[PDB]
Amino acid sequence: SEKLTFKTDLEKLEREKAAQIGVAIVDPQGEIVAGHRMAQRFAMCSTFKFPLAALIFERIDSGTERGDRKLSYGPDMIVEWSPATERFLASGHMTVLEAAQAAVQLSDNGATNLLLREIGGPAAMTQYFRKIGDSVSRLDRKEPEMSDNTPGDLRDTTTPIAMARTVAKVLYGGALTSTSTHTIERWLIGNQTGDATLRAGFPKDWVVGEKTGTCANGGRNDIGFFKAQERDYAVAVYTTAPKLSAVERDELVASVGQVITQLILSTDK
Structure with a gap:
């Protein structure tokens, strides 16, 4: 019955806020716990920066990259919303790890694009999704254009079930070494952009980490993990x-987190 309540609650949010809400919750092996519009395409927006960091950690794990390697750049790397990138510009570089951390925790666009430059562009991000068994998620463009979220555009999209399983792959499914996995987990927990989204709607005793995304045309996303019970x-x-305001869209995602909470609390262990 609890899955029907979940569906009913989300439909009520969609109706009342004039929104479309796609959700997937999976266990560590990627088995479905619950979902809504799980196979509908949505723009990833900044949510892909978590998988990009994973991509980088895999190179590190395989001996093809080091976290401390200096990635040099100039003013042409500065794009809208590049807080760290702008601070490090005078020094002349950011390291692989600094860039990756800024991407994940600040959503830094310049840092993101510096990593994309290094790995051979959006095609390499898509290549990595394929390699960890995600046939759906696709990166086509750098930031900020990838966040355009033009209706009907298949570029830079995922589905909730594909991305949820990619999260589980990264955090639980052995995609990265123990040490890399732990590092990225703590980055998700200490994210500086998620305080008003999903983790605002989860119980305060749950351990949560996540990566947010904001799209043009009313996109607001949050992907990650939680540990309950x-x-x-x-x-x-x-x-x-x-048609919602930016604050209202944060509230919408927090509300989704409340609806998720009620579903999990009503799921037998």
């Missing part, structure tokens, strides 16, 4: 609410 979960939430 001894039990680990991966979650992906994508919403589109063209």
